[PDB]
């Protein structure tokens, strides 16, 4: 067993007895589990395993996300917070001086997002529809990063609408979308952003997620 700093701030790797690598974040709340994930103890510090099969972001890292905009002190707006699997990890990376605002629509799911945010002072949970940023505008703040993961046919403009409210100029957005070319494949969404954004990377999430891809962008 061993734990190693990656390319990216606050993101680590475990080396295992069996010969496999797993992604890894430093636990902001020692001894306390989040979603069944394993706790690992290396050199006095406790790390939470980051399962790439459950989390799209961990997926992207291993699929070769070049630069990760989520670092220490980062302010993030996370649309589609769900039960808290992946924001819990951004909260680890962000550390205490960063802030994660988590928007979620579904009552059942939100109820579990409360448990996570109660123990994590940098997570601010909101039951709200991401279609109406005017309904949490009175609570949030401008952010460095817009993370967006909804299962909606119109994720992009929704993301764009949110961006013009909340994203700092020269901030970044990660958007979760539904072989020999580069990004002709995704011109529809590629272009629609370009009317005001700047693509840096499109990542296919196979075999971690076999339904979705990720777009990293830059707001001009």
């Amino acid at each position: 067993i061993t734990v190693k700093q990656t390319n990216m701030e606050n993101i680590y790797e475990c080396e295992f007895n069996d010969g496999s690598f797993r992604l890894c974040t430093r636990n902001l709340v020692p001894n306390f589990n989040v979603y069944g994930e394993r706790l690992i103890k290396y050199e006095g510090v406790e790390y939470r395993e980051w399962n790439a099969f459950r989390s799209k972001l961990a997926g992207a890292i291993l699929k070769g996300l070049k630069t990760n905009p989520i670092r220490k002190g980062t302010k993030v707006l996370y649309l589609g917070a769900a039960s808290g699997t992946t924001i819990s990890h951004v909260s680890d990376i962000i550390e205490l001086n960063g802030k994660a605002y988590g928007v979620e629509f579904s009552p059942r799911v939100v109820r579990e997002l409360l448990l996570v945010a109660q123990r994590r002072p940098n997570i601010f949970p909101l039951l709200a529809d991401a279609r109406f940023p005017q309904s949490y505008k009175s609570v949030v703040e401008n952010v460095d990063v817009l993370y967006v993961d909804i299962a909606q046919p119109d994720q992009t403009d929704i993301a764009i609408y949110n961006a013009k409210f909340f994203l700092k100029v020269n901030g970044d957005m990660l958007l979760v979308i539904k072989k020999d070319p580069k990004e002709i494949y995704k011109t529809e969404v590629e272009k629609l952003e370009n009317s005001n954004f700047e693509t840096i990377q499109i990542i296919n999430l196979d075999p971690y997620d076999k339904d979705h891809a990720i777009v990293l962008s830059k707001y001009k």
């Binding site: 939100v110 409360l114 039951l127 709200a128």
Partner: peptide, 24 residues
């Protein structure tokens, strides 16, 4: 500020939870 912001967001969403459950 952020200690209060955090207390606030927990109350606000708990409120909206109850009322979403009541309507449902």
């Amino acid at each position: 500020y952020y200690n209060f912001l955090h207390e606030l967001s927990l109350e606000y969403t708990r409120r909206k939870l109850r009322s979403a459950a009541q309507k449902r």
